[model samples]
Target: VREFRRREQEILDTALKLFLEQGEDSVTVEMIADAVGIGKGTIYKHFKSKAEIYLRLMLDYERDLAALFHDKEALSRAYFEFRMRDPQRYRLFDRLEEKVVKTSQVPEMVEELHKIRASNFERLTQLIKERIADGKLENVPPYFHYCAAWALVHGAVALYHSPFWREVLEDQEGFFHFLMDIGVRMGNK
Candidate 1:
């Protein structure tokens, strides 16, 4: 079971790496199989089509990122750490794979992303609510606090992927650092 899980994750990783480099539409199962040294049939056994494999790979990527932010006491810190350290990779993961998710499974993806976003906020709000209950967080309502923070956190990953931002962030680290400074301050105030 563990070995199978490992290989499944390997296939997912290979698919994501290739999709990021070549665009999701440009990659084929045969290509992924060849790149990963697995048979095409082996991939098909785990997934129905390249699109299925693509979305699953992207879902895993997004979920893992959200997982990094599960720390209740250090929400902002964990966010900045993820963004500042690997801005491009994070940006790419933030937007590009989303295209795969949307284009491949529109209604389902939309619904799922909505739930995922809600779950993310729930996790974040848990932290804020904790601090508020413990008198550690500031006085603002939890919902309002999270709305703005979510925007900034979402922006941290989204802005770098924008057309106007194609290659513009001189220091994505500094960008996110400043972003963190502003966001965390807002919550505390």
Candidate 2:
């Protein structure tokens, strides 16, 4: 059983690498199996379908993000840092989830992903509400503040990949920090 789990993780790791290097649509089960040096049949032993693998990867990503929920600053920094550190995986997850949710036969896995996301959102919402009550944040709905932060980070990630912006923004690290600092304090009273 332990060996099975290890092999399953190896298959997932290889699939993620392939998906990152080549777009998800460009990657095939055969390609993943070939990279893992495993038979197509072996891949099926771990995952029922390619979509399931995608959901599994997403679930892992959400769980990792959930671990940092204790500290808002840390959680926010880690979120942005994740994209900056490995934009490939970050973008892969972003795009692949949209494709998978719409077409995947694995409804249960999709629902699980949504649940984790909702849980994370709920935690953040409470944090924001607490901050608002403390007069540290603006008087507004928790979602307003939370969603704004997401928008800022999402925009930063998108800009970070733009060819024109990349060339123009020489100090990418400094820029990210500046945005992050502003994001955290943007709602301050």
Candidate 3:
């Protein structure tokens, strides 16, 4: 059972690499199998379809993020850091999510993904409320601050991938650090 799970994760890791290297639309189960040095049938043993693979990748990503919810102060930084550290995964998740939502055969898994994110959002909202009560955060709605941080981080990720902006920015790393700090403290008083 442990070895079975290890191979399953290996498939996921290979698939994610292919999806990031080539667009998700361009990657196929056969390609993933070849990359993993496994037979295509083996891929099906773990995942029913390519869509299922994509959904599983997202589920794992959300679960990993959920693990950081214990630290209110670290939550925002961790969110940005997770994406910024591997912008490719972030971009792949964003793109695949849009595609998966429209045509996933596995609605149950999609629903599960939504539930996990909803819970994370709830936790962050509660944290914002607590911060506001303590006079550390602004008095606006909890979502306002949450969305603000999201906007800044998402925009930063987008900018990081833009070739035109990449060339225009002389100090990309420094800029990202600055944006991260701003995002973490945007709602602070």
Candidate 4:
């Protein structure tokens, strides 16, 4: 990798780690600098500010998902792997949404963010169409089915990591497997 791009990704990696460990607003550029073994000025040179870095982290996630839109099974598996890979990263989505969505400024990045959203929706709807053509998924509106599936994965992962949900699910030896099963059966009648 090029030296500049490598360092930039390093900064992003540290910032995301701290953002998930600490609150978004609670973490500062200096903290990210300290974690990355770099100076704050270097971070500023690469990013405008903490807010820009924060928004970039979230957008990068969607960009990656959008890139892997070709295979339905692989896309679904990748989503699950991402969630299981880091529960906290999965948990941070809600906070990031509130932070980015509430901003009054419509920067150049927002245009790219919108394209990522469209790409994801297109990929998801295509998955629905594929299933509808086969016998696996039927009798459901495409958009609603996509939304429900999205919610199921997003919500289920959050709940799975919560202490409240964990306490309740502790009694079920196969709760994790059960959750996975539910997703598999979602499109089935």
Candidate 5:
């Protein structure tokens, strides 16, 4: 079981790398298998199809982001780092929505994603509350304040593939600027 899990992760990891280097539609089961030095049959033994592999990869990405949000101070830093390294990571939800969300194929998977998303919200809310109590932040509703930051990041990521983004953002340095503004604005009483 341990060995299989390791092999499964290897497949997932290899497929992710390929998907990142190319586009998702261009990556095939055979490509992933070749990259991982495994047979296509072995890959199928772990995942039913390329779609299944894509869904599983999204789940893994959510888990990774959740893990990074384990610390308030580190959450934004970790997320930004991940995004910088994987420029395609911003395209994650749009593709998942096309593949998973549009179909009735994965209600359970959607529920799991919601759970992960909610946990991150809860963590941010808690951090907001702490800052308020410590006199580090104003007494605004935590969720409201948190949602502002969320909207900024989500909107940026959503527009990452847009021609509009290409025109407005010469680079993503403004992301760090907005992150710092969140800290200062929320901290001001």
Candidate 6:
């Protein structure tokens, strides 16, 4: 099973490279298997179809990200610090994933995705709620704040993708600008 996992990951890595270089629609299962030096039939044993492979790879990406958010500092750094470090990759994958989730035929595959995506947001909501109780981020509804944070982080990524902002900030500090300007809103409690 361990070897199988490794082989599957190799296949996945190859497929991802191909998908990235070409477009998702241009990559075929046979191409992935050929690149990996494995028969396509063997590839199917690990994943039922190309779609399943795509979804699994997407989950793997989410799982790694969720793991990074295991600490609040990590979560905060991701948006406000780390994200700027790798703008093009971060910006592109996120935008791509959001669209992928909506168009996916396998809805259940994304049920877990929401849980992963919301980990930090849930923590933020709780913090915001406490702040509201103590007159911190006054009148910020949990869900609204959640959306704001989500949008803010995502927007930095979007901006990074923009030709105008590509060279503005190396990583985190650039993203912090996004939070300071668009993400955080101070109002009456």
Most TM-score-accurate candidate:
3
Model 5, 1-189: lDDT tens per residue? 997999999998888888878978888999999988888798878988777876787778778767775544455445545544454765755677777767877567667767876786676677778767776667888776677666656655556657876787675676645654554454456
The runs of at least 3 residues in candidate 2 whose Cα sits more than 4 Å from the true structure, single-residue gaps closed, are 70-72, 82-85
Candidate 4 residue lDDT tens string, 1-189: 486799999999988889877777799999999999988788888887776886687689887777666455545555555544455776676676676745654466766777787888787788777767776776678876787777777787677677887676565436655665566567675
The lDDT per prediction is: 0.68, 0.80, 0.82, 0.73, 0.70, 0.65
Clashes of each: 0, 0, 0, 0, 0, 3
Structural similarity to truth (TM-score) of each candidate:
0.69, 0.85, 0.90, 0.83, 0.73, 0.65
lDDT of 4: 0.73
Best by lDDT: 3
Q: Name the lDDT of candidate 6.
A: 0.65
Model 6 TM-score is 0.65
lDDT tens digits by residue: candidate 6, 23-50: 7778899899999999978987888777
User: Residue 52: error of model 4 in Å?
Assistant: 1.2
156 Cα displacement, candidate 2 (Å): 1.3
Q: How accurate locally is residue 172 in candidate 1, as Cα lDDT from 0 to 100?
A: 57
Task: Report the poorest 10 consecutive residues by lDDT, candidate 2.
Answer: 75-84
Better of 3 and 6 by lDDT: 3
Q: After superposition on all CA atoms, how large is the RMSD of candidate 2?
A: 2.4
